Amino acid sequence: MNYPAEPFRIKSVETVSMIPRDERLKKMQEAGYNTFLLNSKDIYIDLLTDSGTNAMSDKQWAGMMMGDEAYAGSENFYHLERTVQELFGFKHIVPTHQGRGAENLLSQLAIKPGQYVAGNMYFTTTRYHQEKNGAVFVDIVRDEAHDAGLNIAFKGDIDLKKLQKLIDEKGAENIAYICLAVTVNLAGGQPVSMANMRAVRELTAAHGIKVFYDATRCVENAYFIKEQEQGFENKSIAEIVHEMFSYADGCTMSGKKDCLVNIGGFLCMNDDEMFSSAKELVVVYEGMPSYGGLAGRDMEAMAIGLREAMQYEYIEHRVKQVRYLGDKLKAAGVPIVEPVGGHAVFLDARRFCEHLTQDEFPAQSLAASIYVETGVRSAERGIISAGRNNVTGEHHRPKLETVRLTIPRRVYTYAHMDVVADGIIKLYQHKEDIRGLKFIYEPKQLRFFTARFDYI
Amino acid sequence: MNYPAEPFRIKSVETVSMIPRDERLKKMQEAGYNTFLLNSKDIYIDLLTDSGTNAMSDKQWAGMMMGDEAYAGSENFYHLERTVQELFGFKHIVPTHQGRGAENLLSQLAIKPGQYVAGNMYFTTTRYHQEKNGAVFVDIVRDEAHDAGLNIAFKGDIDLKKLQKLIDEKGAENIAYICLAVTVNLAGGQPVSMANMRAVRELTAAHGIKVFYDATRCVENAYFIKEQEQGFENKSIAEIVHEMFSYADGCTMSGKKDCLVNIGGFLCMNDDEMFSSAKELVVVYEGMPSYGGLAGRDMEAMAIGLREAMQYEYIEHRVKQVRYLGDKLKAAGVPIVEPVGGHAVFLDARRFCEHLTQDEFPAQSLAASIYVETGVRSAERGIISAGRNNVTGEHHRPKLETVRLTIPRRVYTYAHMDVVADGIIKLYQHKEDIRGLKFIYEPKQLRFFTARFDYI
Amino acid sequence: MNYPAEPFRIKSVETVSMIPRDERLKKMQEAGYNTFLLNSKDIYIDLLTDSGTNAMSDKQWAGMMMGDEAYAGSENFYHLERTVQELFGFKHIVPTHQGRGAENLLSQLAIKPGQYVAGNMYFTTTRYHQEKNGAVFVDIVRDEAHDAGLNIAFKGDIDLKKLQKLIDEKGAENIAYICLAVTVNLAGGQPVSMANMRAVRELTAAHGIKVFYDATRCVENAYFIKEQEQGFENKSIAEIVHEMFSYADGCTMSGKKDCLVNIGGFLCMNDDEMFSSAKELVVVYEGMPSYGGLAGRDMEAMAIGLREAMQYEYIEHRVKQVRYLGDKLKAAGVPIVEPVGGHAVFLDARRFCEHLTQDEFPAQSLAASIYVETGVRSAERGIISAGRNNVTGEHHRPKLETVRLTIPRRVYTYAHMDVVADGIIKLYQHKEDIRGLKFIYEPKQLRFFTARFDYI
Amino acid sequence: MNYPAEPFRIKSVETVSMIPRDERLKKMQEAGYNTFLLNSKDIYIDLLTDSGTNAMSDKQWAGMMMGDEAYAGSENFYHLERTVQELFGFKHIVPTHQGRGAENLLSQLAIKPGQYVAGNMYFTTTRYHQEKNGAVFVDIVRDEAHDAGLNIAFKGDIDLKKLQKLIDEKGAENIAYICLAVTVNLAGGQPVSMANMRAVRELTAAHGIKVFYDATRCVENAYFIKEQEQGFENKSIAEIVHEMFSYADGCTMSGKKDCLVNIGGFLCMNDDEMFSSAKELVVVYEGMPSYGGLAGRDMEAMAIGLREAMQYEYIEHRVKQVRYLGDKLKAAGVPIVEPVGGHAVFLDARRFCEHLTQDEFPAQSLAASIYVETGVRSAERGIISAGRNNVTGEHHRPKLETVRLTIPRRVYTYAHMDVVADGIIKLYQHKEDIRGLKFIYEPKQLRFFTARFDYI
Ligand SMILES: CC1=C([O-])/C(=C\[NH+]=C(/Cc2cccc(Br)c2)C(=O)O)C(COP(=O)(O)O)=CN1
Ligand SMILES: CC1=C([O-])/C(=C\[NH+]=C(/Cc2cccc(Br)c2)C(=O)O)C(COP(=O)(O)O)=CN1
Ligand SMILES: *Cc1c(COP(=O)(O)O)cnc(C)c1O
Ligand SMILES: *Cc1c(COP(=O)(O)O)cnc(C)c1O
Ligand SMILES: [Cl-]
Ligand SMILES: [Cl-]
Ligand SMILES: [Cl-]
Ligand SMILES: [K+]
Ligand SMILES: [K+]
Ligand SMILES: [K+]
Numbered sequence A, B, C, D: 001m002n003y004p005a006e007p008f009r010i011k012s013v014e015t016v017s018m019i020p021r022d023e024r025l026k027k028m029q030e031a032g033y034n035t036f037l038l039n040s041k042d043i044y045i046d047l048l049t050d051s052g053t054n055a056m057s058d059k060q061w062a063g064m065m066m067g068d069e070a071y072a073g074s075e076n077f078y079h080l081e082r083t084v085q086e087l088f089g090f091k092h093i094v095p096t097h098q099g100r101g102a103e104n105l106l107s108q109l110a111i112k113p114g115q116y117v118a119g120n121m122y123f124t125t126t127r128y129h130q131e132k133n134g135a136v137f138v139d140i141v142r143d144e145a146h147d148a149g150l151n152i153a154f155k156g157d158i159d160l161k162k163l164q165k166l167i168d169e170k171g172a173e174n175i176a177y178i179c180l181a182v183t184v185n186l187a188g189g190q191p192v193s194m195a196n197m198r199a200v201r202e203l204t205a206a207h208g209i210k211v212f213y214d215a216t217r218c219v220e221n222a223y224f225i226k227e228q229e230q231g232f233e234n235k236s237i238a239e240i241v242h243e244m245f246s247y248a249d250g251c252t253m254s255g256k257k258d259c260l261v262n263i264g265g266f267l268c269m270n271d272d273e274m275f276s277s278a279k280e281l282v283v284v285y286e287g288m289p290s291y292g293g294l295a296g297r298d299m300e301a302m303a304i305g306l307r308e309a310m311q312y313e314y315i316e317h318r319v320k321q322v323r324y325l326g327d328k329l330k331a332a333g334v335p336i337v338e339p340v341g342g343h344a345v346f347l348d349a350r351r352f353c354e355h356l357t358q359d360e361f362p363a364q365s366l367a368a369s370i371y372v373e374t375g376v377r378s379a380e381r382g383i384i385s386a387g388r389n390n391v392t393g394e395h396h397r398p399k400l401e402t403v404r405l406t407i408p409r410r411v412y413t414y415a416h417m418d419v420v421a422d423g424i425i426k427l428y429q430h431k432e433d434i435r436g437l438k439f440i441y442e443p444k445q446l447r448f449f450t451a452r453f454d455y456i
C-alpha cells in the first residue's frame, strides 16, 4: 500500500559481486551445507542476520572520531548512559560488548537453579544462558504465534492464561523472571502490543514477579504499535518506546539490532542492589561498568544510533522495506510466515519443502539451496536452531520450520529485494529438488552456528 | 537488464530532513522561489549537480585516512600520477583542485590570442577560460546535437566538415586546439563515438593541430561506446577509456564528475615543454606540481575513485539509473531532451509550461514547484542562468529553457528516482497551474545565484 | 640513544586539560578514593592503564574504514588469522572481545576442578578465571621477582625448581597447565628470557603438561630479550616473538596492550580438538569464531597493530619512554620497583609510605594522593588488587605494594613524562601526609576495579 | 625559559620511515641536492613548510565525517561563514581552495593598471598576483626587518614615514592598497604590533586608502601581541585577533597555516560592491561562492580549526616549541634570524657557511647536509628561492641567505626538535666541510622547486 523511498542518502558504499553458480556449489559443500559457515566475500546479498550488519550514519561516524578511550569514566559512557536513561527510562545501565554478554550477566544474577523463566518464545543465546544457570524455560506466547499462515496483529503477545497457569502450578516465588521480547523473533519478528505489556506488568506485579524485556528490536516493535494499535496513531516512536519500558524492571539489548551499530549492547535495571551485583560481574567477563567490553567510540556510536532509530520515517521505511520483500514473495505464492515482521521475511520451509520431513532439516537445506541458486545468504530458523532439549537429548521440534531472510538496517535497496525475491521464486518452481540433510558434526549447544551436514 | 540492481551496498548513510510539503513551501518562498538559495539541510534529494556530490567507497575513505600531507613528494601524488598514466595513457599529469583549475592552466599555456578553439559545443567555464585568453570559440558539433528531441546515438560527435571548413577559412596555424568534450553536457550528456575521436585525431594531426579532451564524464562516455558502438561490445571500460585518450594530446579533468570524488581535478599532456610551463603556472593559481591545490588525501581518493570508475557494473548502473528516470518521464508524456544522457535528465520547461512566456521564467518556477512537491532540488538551466545582455539590457534568450535533474554518483536509489519522476509527472498533469515568476531582486551578475522572485 | 625521539609523527590530537586542586579533591572523595572510579573528563594525564588507551596509526584508521561487518566469514577475520599465524606461529586462532574473554574460554576448556594452574605471578582476571573453574593457582616465579629493589635481568623467569617440586608433590596429571606470562605485570613489567621459555617447554612436555602463554605484552618482552639476552642483540623483534611462541601450546592475548588497539583480544592453540571445543564455547559468550565479539573493523585494526608492533624503533621508544620516567623518579629519590619494566613505572608504596602498614592500603591511598595533587591518574597494584583469599577469608598480602604509572602506547611525550615525574617528586616531599584507608564497599572478586574506601 | 608541555595528547600517529644516513645520501643525490625534490616517504621530520602540514584534532576529524557536499547552501559553508564573521569581524567571506586563490581574487578586484601596492615586505604569490594585475610593489617595512641578528620586538611593523612618503610622492589616489601581512614570513615570521596596525589604519584612512591583510599567520601574530605588547596582557587571543582585523578593509587567508588544516583559504571584505564582484570572479577560478574550490568537509575542518587556534595554551605551545629549537640553536652559537618567528627558525646560512659566497648556494647545500645527517627536510630561503632577475639574467641577491626549519602545527614534539637541533649543531661544529653547490639544471622561473645541483 506504501513503499516509501529511503529517508536518507547514501554517503559511502561497499562493492558487491556474484560468483558463478559452480563456485557457489563448491563453497556450500565446503561449508558443510551450513550457511553460517560460508565466507563473506563469497556472498552477494548477505541476509544471514540483521545483527551488527547495519549501516551507520554520518553523525555516528562523526562520533566514531570522538572516542574517549579512557579505561574508566569515558565521556562516551556518560553519553550512552544519559541517552538510554532518557529514551528507555531505566535507572541504571551496564554496557556489554553485545547482547549475549548482557544475558550472561542477567542470568547469573537473577536465576537460582530449578527456577522457571517464562517468555514469549525465545532467542537461542537467551534461552541457553537461562538454562546454563539452572532455569527451566516455559513458552507463554499466545498459540497463534506458532501458526505460520495466520495473519493476525500482535502475534507476539503473551497469553496471560499461560502465565497465570504457570503461577498457579509452580508458585510465583519459583519464577525467576518473565523475559518479554519485543519484537518476537521466532514468530517472524512479531510485535507485542502496549496493552499486552501493561497486562503482563499488572499480573506479574501483583505476584512480585520481575519482568525483563529483550529489547533488541524494541524500535521495530514501537512502530507496529504506532501503526496499528488504536490510541497511539499520534504518539511519537520515542514516547511509545518510553511507555513500553515503563512496564519492565530492566532489559537486555543487542545494540547490534535496533541501535544501528556493528557491535554493542547493554543491560538495564531499576533495582539498585541488582545494579551493584551486575557491576561486580561485568568486570569478570566484559570489562568496567563504564565500558563493558566496548571501545569508547562504540559507546558513542550506540548512543547516537539509538536516538536515530526513534525517527519515524527511518523506522517506517525499515519495516516497510521488509514488507515489500514479503509482499512480493507472497504475491508469487511462495509460502511465508505472516504477517511480515519488522526485521526479516521468514520463508515457511515446511510448505516450501513438503516432500521432506522436519527430521531431514528442510529449513537448513533450503537455506543452502537459496545460496547455491542465488548467491543470497539466509539463516536456518527451525529444528536446527531450536537445538536439543537438554532433558530428553532429542531435537526440540518447533512447529515453525522457517528460513530467515534477515534485512540489515540501511544497507540494501528495493532493487536488492527484487533480486532476492526473484531468485527465491525461481527456486520455488523446482522446490522438490531440495534434498534432506543429516548431521556430520553437531556442537553441544547453539549448534546451528557451526554444525556441518551432508545430504541424505 | 534494463535497470540493474545497485552493484554495491550502503556502507554509511547521510542524514536528511524529511521536511513536509507545508514547510517546503515556506522554505521555497523564503528562498525567493530560487532553488539556488535553498539550504542543503532543507533538501531531501539534491539534483542541482552531479559535480562533487558523489558518494565515495569504503576503499576511498580508507585512502582518506592515509593522506600524506607533505608539500612536495606526497605518496598520494605518486599514486594519482601512476593511476592516471596507467588508465589515460598520457605522459604527464598536473593535479588541480577541480576542472576549471586545469582549464585555466591549459587555456593560458596553449592559446595565443586571436587563435580559434573549436569544440563540440562548450561548457561555461571551459569556454570562458578559452575566451579570457583571447580565443575565438567555434561550435563544430553536428547540427543534430542542437535538436533537443532528435533521438540519435552519439549525438555529441563533431561534424568533420565543420572542422575542415574552419581549417580552410582560418588556417591551421590560427587554431590553438580542438576541445573535444566527452560527454557533451550542453546537449544533455551526449556521448562521442570512438570512430569520431579517431576521425578528429586524424584530420588534426594532418595539420599539426592539437586536441585536448574535456574529460569530465569520459567514463559515462566509455559506457555508451561499450553499449552501442559496433566492435566494442566485448572491450572493457578501461580498454575503451585508454583508447579514447590515445586520440588526444592531453585533457582537462574534473574528478568531481567521473572520478567519484567531492573535490579534485587534473591536467594531462604528452608534450614535455607544455608540462614544464604548466608546472610554473600551477604554482601561481593552484599549488605545487605535487599537490595542485589538493590535500594529499584527496589526491588519494581521486586515484582510487578513477580506478573504481572502470568497473563495468558500476558505470552500467550509473547510466541506467539516469535512464530509468528519463524513461519514466518520457512514458508519461513529460517533454525531455533526448536521448537521455549519462548524468542527468533535462526537462524542456518551454513545452512543459507553454502557457508561460520565456520572460515569465518557466524553468525557474518549474524548479521551484518541483522542490515544493517532492523535496527535490533541480537546476534552472535557461533564461535566468543565461544572464542579461548588458549592452542592450534585455535577457539573453537561450534556445534551451530546461530544468536539469542532475544525478550524483552512488548517492540515490531507484526509489528516489521515483520520488522525482512521480512528482514531476503530477506537476505535468496540472502544468497549466504553474505560475509565472517576476524578479523582485536581480543582481547585475551571477543573477542565477542570488536573484529573488515573486509569482506574477 | 638512551631516550630516542618518537619514531612517528602526530597525525591527530586530543586536547588535555586540568581542573583545579579543590575540584580534584571533591572528585577523589566522590570516587571513594579509588582512582578506578574517577571520570575521564576530570583526569589530566591518565596513567590508570595501558589497556585499550593506545593511539592507533593512520594505517589502522585506514583499516577502520574497511570493516567487513558480515556476521560470519568477515575478510577482517581472515586478515587477523593469517597475521597471528604468521607472527606467533600458532595453528588456530579464536577472536575474543578482549583478554578476559579469551581467559574465560581457556579456563573453562582446560581446567578440571581440583587441578593446579602454575604461573610466574598472575594477572587478576587471569587468576580469577582459573579459580572460578576450580583450579588452585601456584606461583612459580623466581624469588627475586618479589624483591622490589633488586635490579636483576629477566625477573619474570619461572623457577624450574618450583615447577619440578609442584610436579613431584601434586602429580603432572593434576596440573591443568602452566600459564607463562610475558612480560610479568606484577613484578613491574619484568621480562622472561628465551632460555627460561625453552627450559619450561622441555620440562613440561616430558610430563605431558601444556603451556599457555599470557601473550599480552609479548612484544615488550621480545624487546628485553633483544636488548639484554646474550646472542639476540641483532635478531629482529619478529624473530624473537616467533621463537618465543614456539615454546607454547597456545596463548591468551589482550590486544588492547601490545596489539596497539582500543579493543580486542584472542585465544590461540595448536591442538585441533581444543580448537573445536573453543569454537563451540565462543558463541556462548563472545560471538562467532570469525568475529568473537568484535566489529570487523576491530579485527582489522588489531591485525594491523600487531604487525606494527614488530617495528624495532617503535618498541624501543615505547619501552625507553617508560624508562625515562622511572629514571627521573629514581634520581630524585622516589622509591620504585627496579629495573623499570616494559609498560609502566611501579612506585614502591611500601617505601613511599613507610608510616603506613599494608593493612592500611598505602598503595591505594598513594594513588588517590597523586591524583589530588597532580591530576595524574594511576593504579593500585598491591594488597587491594591482590584480593581476598577465599579459603581463609584474609587479604592476600603481596610483598609488592606498588602504584602503577601505566603508559598508553604512542599517546604521551617526554614533556608529559616530566610533568608526571615533577608532580610525584613534589608529593614525595610531604609523603608523611598520606593517610591510611579502609574499605566501605568491597566487591566479592576483582575488588580493586570498583571498591570504595574512606580515610582511617 | 618556559617550554610548556603539549596541551594535547596524541589521538593517532602518522607512520614514518627513518632511513639511515647512507640511504639518505643516495636519496639526496637522486634529488639533485634539492630538498624540494625529496620524496615524503624518505623523510623522518619534514620541516619544508608549515603550510597544509598541520595535524588536525579529533573534533576536526569528526567534522570531516560531516561533509555536506552540496554545490550551494552547504551547512559547512554556513559554519565557516559565521565563524569567520564572528572571529575576524568582516562582513563578507568568499571561500577559496587556499591562500593564493584569494590573492588572485583580491588583486583582480582592487588594483588598477599603474597603481602601487605597498606592504611590509612581501610573499611570493601575493606580490606576483599584485604585479600581474598591474601594481607596482613598494616595501614599507621598517629598515630593521632586514637585519637578521637584530633581536627586537614587532620587527614586522610598517614604517609610517615610508608610507607617508609614498603618499606624498605618488598621491593616495594612485595607491591601490596597503598589503599588511601578519606575521611577516620573509623577515622570519616576525609579528606586527597592534599599535602599528592602528597607526597604519589612521594614516591610510586620512587619505581614503584601502588596507588588506595577509592573515595567514594572524594567530601566531596575536600571540606575540599578547605576550609582548603593553595593553594586551589580559586580552584573549580571540579579542586580539578581532581587534587586529578591525583595522583592515579585508583579508586574504591561507587556512593551511593558522586555521590548522591541510587545505583551505578565504577572502574577506566589508564592501558590498567588492563582494558582489568577488562572487562573479570566484566562479571562474575556484568554484561557487558557496564552496570556493573546497569540499564541504574542508570548509568544516577549517571552521573548526580557526576556532581551535584561538586557544591560548595551543598557540602559546605552538610558538614556544619553535622558540625551543631556536633557543637551543642559539645557545650552541648557531647563527639564526632573531627573534625567532612564529612558525619557523631561520638559519643564517651566510654565516653558517662563511667560507662560501652567496653564488655558491650555501643555504641550498646546508639544507642538503641537514637532511643527509638527520633525516630532517628544510627549505632553502635565500638566493635560490629569490630567483634570477631575468631582465639582467643574473642572480637576485637577497640580504637573507637562510635555511628555514618550518614547523607544522601539532605534528612534532620537543624530542623531534632535539633531533633537528642536535644534528645542526654537530654539522655546525665542522661547518667548514660543507661544500658549495652549482646549477646542473635551472628552470627559467620558480627554480626553487625543480632546480638541480652538484658539489663544486
Ligand atoms: C563538461 C564540463 C563540466 O561538466 C564541468 C563541471 N560542471 C558543473 C559545475 C558547474 C560549473 C558552473 C556553474 C555551475 Br551551476 C556548475 C556542473 O554542475 O555540471 C567542468 C568544470 O569542472 P569543475 O567544476 O571541476 O571546475 C568542465 N567541463
Ligand atoms: C605570508 C603568506 C604565505 O606564507 C603563504 C604560503 N606560504 C608557504 C607555502 C609555499 C611554499 C613554497 C613556495 C610557495 Br609559492 C608557497 C610557506 O611555506 O611559507 C601564502 C600563500 O598561501 P597558500 O600557500 O595557501 O596559497 C600567502 N601568504
Ligand atoms: C541477536 C539477539 C540476541 C543476542 O544478541 P547478540 O548481540 O547477538 O549477542 C538476543 N535476543 C534477541 C531477540 C536477538 O535477536
Ligand atoms: C590486561 C591483561 C589481561 C586482561 O586483558 P583484558 O583485555 O583487560 O581483559 C590479562 N593478562 C595480562 C598480563 C594483562 O596485562
Ligand atoms: Cl541467529
Ligand atoms: Cl607565484
Ligand atoms: Cl588493571
Ligand atoms: K563537494
Ligand atoms: K578503550
Ligand atoms: K559486525
Ligand SMILES: [K+]
Residues within 6 Å of the ligand: B069, B070, B071, B294, B295, B296, D051, D052, D053, D262, D263
Ligand atoms: K596538505
